[PDB]
Design an enzyme around this catalytic site. Sequence first.
Site, PDB file in Angstrom:
ATOM      1  N   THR A 121       0.821  -1.225  -0.093  1.00 31.66           N
ATOM      2  CA  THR A 121      -0.065   0.159   0.168  1.00 31.66           C
ATOM      3  C   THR A 121       0.926   1.513  -0.180  1.00 31.66           C
ATOM      4  OG1 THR A 121      -1.410  -1.149   1.770  1.00 31.66           O
ATOM      5  CG2 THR A 121      -2.176   1.000   0.376  1.00 31.66           C
ATOM      6  N   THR A 122       1.773   1.368   1.173  1.00 29.49           N
ATOM      7  CA  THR A 122       2.898   2.716   0.730  1.00 29.49           C
ATOM      8  C   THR A 122       3.594   2.596  -0.395  1.00 29.49           C
ATOM      9  OG1 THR A 122       2.617   1.842   3.203  1.00 29.49           O
ATOM     10  CG2 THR A 122       5.063   3.488   2.201  1.00 29.49           C
ATOM     11  N   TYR A 142     -11.766  -4.353  -2.237  1.00 34.34           N
ATOM     12  CA  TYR A 142     -13.278  -3.710  -2.574  1.00 34.34           C
ATOM     13  C   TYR A 142     -14.717  -4.695  -2.892  1.00 34.34           C
ATOM     14  CZ  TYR A 142     -16.249  -1.673  -6.474  1.00 34.34           C
ATOM     15  OH  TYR A 142     -16.993  -0.858  -7.091  1.00 34.34           O
ATOM     16  N   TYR A 191      -1.912 -10.033   5.214  1.00 36.57           N
ATOM     17  CA  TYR A 191      -2.406  -8.572   5.742  1.00 36.57           C
ATOM     18  C   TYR A 191      -3.613  -8.475   5.968  1.00 36.57           C
ATOM     19  CZ  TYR A 191      -1.571  -4.003   4.731  1.00 36.57           C
ATOM     20  OH  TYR A 191      -1.513  -2.345   4.834  1.00 36.57           O
ATOM     21  N   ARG A 194      -8.889  -0.579   4.731  1.00 31.26           N
ATOM     22  CA  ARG A 194      -8.729  -0.078   3.293  1.00 31.26           C
ATOM     23  C   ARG A 194      -9.293  -1.237   2.572  1.00 31.26           C
ATOM     24  NH1 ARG A 194      -4.422   2.802   1.418  1.00 31.26           N
ATOM     25  NH2 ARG A 194      -4.027   4.822   2.848  1.00 31.26           N
ATOM     26  N   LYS A 219       0.234  -9.604   8.901  1.00 33.82           N
ATOM     27  CA  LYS A 219       0.814  -8.336   9.622  1.00 33.82           C
ATOM     28  C   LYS A 219      -0.853  -7.859   9.563  1.00 33.82           C
ATOM     29  CE  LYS A 219       1.411  -4.494   6.834  1.00 33.82           C
ATOM     30  NZ  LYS A 219       1.483  -3.002   5.863  1.00 33.82           N
ATOM     31  N   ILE A 245       5.863  -4.331   9.743  1.00 33.81           N
ATOM     32  CA  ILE A 245       6.405  -3.889   8.989  1.00 33.81           C
ATOM     33  C   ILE A 245       5.743  -2.159   8.500  1.00 33.81           C
ATOM     34  CG2 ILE A 245       4.894  -3.862   6.153  1.00 33.81           C
ATOM     35  CD1 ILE A 245       5.012  -6.787   6.978  1.00 33.81           C
TER      36      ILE A 245
HETATM   37  N1  3VN Z   1      -0.027  -3.436  -9.056  1.00 33.43           N
HETATM   38  C1  3VN Z   1      -0.371  -3.164  -9.498  1.00 33.43           C
HETATM   39  C2  3VN Z   1      -1.735  -3.775 -10.312  1.00 33.43           C
HETATM   40  C3  3VN Z   1      -3.234  -2.932  -9.951  1.00 33.43           C
HETATM   41  C4  3VN Z   1      -4.101  -3.302 -10.417  1.00 33.43           C
HETATM   42  C5  3VN Z   1      -5.441  -2.544  -9.472  1.00 33.43           C
HETATM   43  N2  3VN Z   1      -5.572  -1.263  -9.533  1.00 33.43           N
HETATM   44  C6  3VN Z   1      -6.738  -3.017  -9.808  1.00 33.43           C
HETATM   45  C7  3VN Z   1      -7.128  -4.700  -9.447  1.00 33.43           C
HETATM   46  C8  3VN Z   1      -8.646  -4.816 -10.152  1.00 33.43           C
HETATM   47  N3  3VN Z   1      -8.381  -6.238 -10.084  1.00 33.43           N
HETATM   48  C9  3VN Z   1      -8.823  -4.742 -11.776  1.00 33.43           C
HETATM   49  C10 3VN Z   1      -9.929  -5.429 -12.706  1.00 33.43           C
HETATM   50  C11 3VN Z   1      -9.702  -4.955 -13.881  1.00 33.43           C
HETATM   51  C12 3VN Z   1     -11.347  -5.231 -14.371  1.00 33.43           C
HETATM   52  N4  3VN Z   1     -12.418  -4.709 -14.314  1.00 33.43           N
HETATM   53  C13 3VN Z   1      -9.441  -4.452  -9.894  1.00 33.43           C
HETATM   54  O1  3VN Z   1      -9.365  -2.806 -10.203  1.00 33.43           O
HETATM   55  O2  3VN Z   1     -10.655  -5.069  -9.090  1.00 33.43           O
HETATM   56  C14 3VN Z   1      -5.375  -2.962  -8.217  1.00 33.43           C
HETATM   57  O3  3VN Z   1      -5.557  -4.304  -7.699  1.00 33.43           O
HETATM   58  O4  3VN Z   1      -5.279  -2.358  -7.011  1.00 33.43           O
HETATM   59 MG    MG Z   2       0.556  -7.047  -0.378  1.00 32.79          MG
END
Ligand code: 3VN
Ligand code: MG
Lengths: 293, 296
Positions: free
Chosen positions: A42-43, A106, A132, A137, A161, A202
Amino acid sequence: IIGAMTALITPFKNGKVDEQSYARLIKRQIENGIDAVVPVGTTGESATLTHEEHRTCIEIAVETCKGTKVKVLAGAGSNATHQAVGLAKFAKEHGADGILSVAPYYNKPTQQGLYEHYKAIAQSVDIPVLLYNVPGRTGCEISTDTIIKLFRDCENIYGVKEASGNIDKCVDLLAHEPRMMLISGEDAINYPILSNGGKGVISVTSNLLPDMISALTHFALDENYKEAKKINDELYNINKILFCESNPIPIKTAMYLAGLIESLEFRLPLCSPSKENFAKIEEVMKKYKIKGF
Amino acid sequence: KNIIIGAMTALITPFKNGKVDEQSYARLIKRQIENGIDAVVPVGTTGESATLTHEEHRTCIEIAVETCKGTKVKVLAGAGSNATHQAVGLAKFAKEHGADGILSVAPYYNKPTQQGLYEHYKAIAQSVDIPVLLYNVPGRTGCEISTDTIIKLFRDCENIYGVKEASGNIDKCVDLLAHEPRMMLISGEDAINYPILSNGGKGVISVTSNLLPDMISALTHFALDENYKEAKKINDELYNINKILFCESNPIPIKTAMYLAGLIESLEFRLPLCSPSKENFAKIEEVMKKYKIKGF
Ligand SMILES: NCCCC[C@@](N)(CC[C@](N)(CCCCN)C(=O)O)C(=O)O
Ligand SMILES: [Mg+2]
Ligand SMILES: [Mg+2]
Ligand SMILES: [Mg+2]
């Protein structure tokens, strides 16, 4: 993997990862007693890095830690399990000593879902996996029951964590499963978690004050709770101010204010702090001696 | 402002052998159209946006757009992301492939500040010329679009026309419409569809409408005509199913209900989502018995 660990910030220069600064920041962590580094948590603004960038950060870090006794606990969490497995394999293939894997955000999986998500991850590799939990969040919480079952059922899963502000849960975890490695994920209560048998941190704060966080953790692991509490108390003001806005906005501001990175750059939706909070961070920093390079 | 309002459905995404059942997706959208729904939302939270590939996300938007051509039904494309660069790209995609507008959830996990949220949505809105509906769901994202931020975005950005609220906060719904009555407040919480509509909300983005589109359709249109007695009666009738569809994290119950109704072939999710408990499966089945579920 245990001990004092740093959730590394990811410096940007002109909209790209500053790779030389990234390696230089990790060396500074090594110089100041840190036991492991966590690239792209996250950081480290994992949400806004591209896949390539995520991958490269882990690589620098594994490479920069090579030869030292400092381990790399790679950020490999995802809210899509296919993706988390993917990341786990990548880390393993590229020499991480282990993996950190945030609870899916989410989508709010159920406890059964979490179990499945992590079992999948754990079985895809042979390096240590660190769980973790940060419900503020992610919108979900790994239950104590789920953590424990995962710990017992999956060889690689060795701990969690915890960033939930719930010392009751920390007692709950170590009373029922004392063999797991509870890691503090909230700097302000590093000592209370370690003094209940936690085995590491961490840290966000260790980005700016790695010597102080490393000493705190090592005092505690050596059962000098007096001196560990001393540092924890001394660090409270900075530990709180580093979350006056959502992490890593304050810590990057602090790193920039200390001249440790070239540019106070984030990737949207992250942004600069308010001018007032900028001044508040600057003010609190002045009471601490900040190690250079 | 150009707007998309009325009774809208957060479409589930059916899976078959680990792949998007594109034929069942189109069939499900046609069922929504034929039961009075005004717009469909492909690949929202209910559509399992988190676990779709980028290509699958694009495909479902295109299927929605193609299925709603030649009808009055609009496509409000799910286009949110916790990375502004990705959200702008999705907005652009939706625009270029015929969506009528986009829904864009507040960034999840990384918890931007109000200033960051403003900048995030301003970049999205300035990237297209189609309506943009904010989506506030703090229980899932870890952050909230404050009323002030929502209003600022509404007044500062031409295409930002309202907000889908899933926060169980009717006080905020009063606050929003008392200080900016021109915005389109959209219910993102099925149980309280009628209270939000009765305070001047102009539509719903519903999970329950996947199962009972005709009832959600009637509720919203009754309410929009200020036939509040009839709208409230449907809202009250729907409360039991509205609640049971969140016994477990959405969309686990609604997909379970759709499967039980014979509307999808398989009870398939993408991890970390999974089938409900055996107990909740039975509870959903029992509640369903009290409602008439339209077929195809
Ligand atoms: N570490 C780099 C990758 C970052 C990808 C993403 N921004 C979005 C992850 C994702 N599963 C992508 C979905 C794509 C199709 N909608 C999300 O948005 O939930 C996240 O994991 O926060
Ligand atoms: Mg992680
Ligand atoms: Mg050491
Ligand atoms: Mg009429």
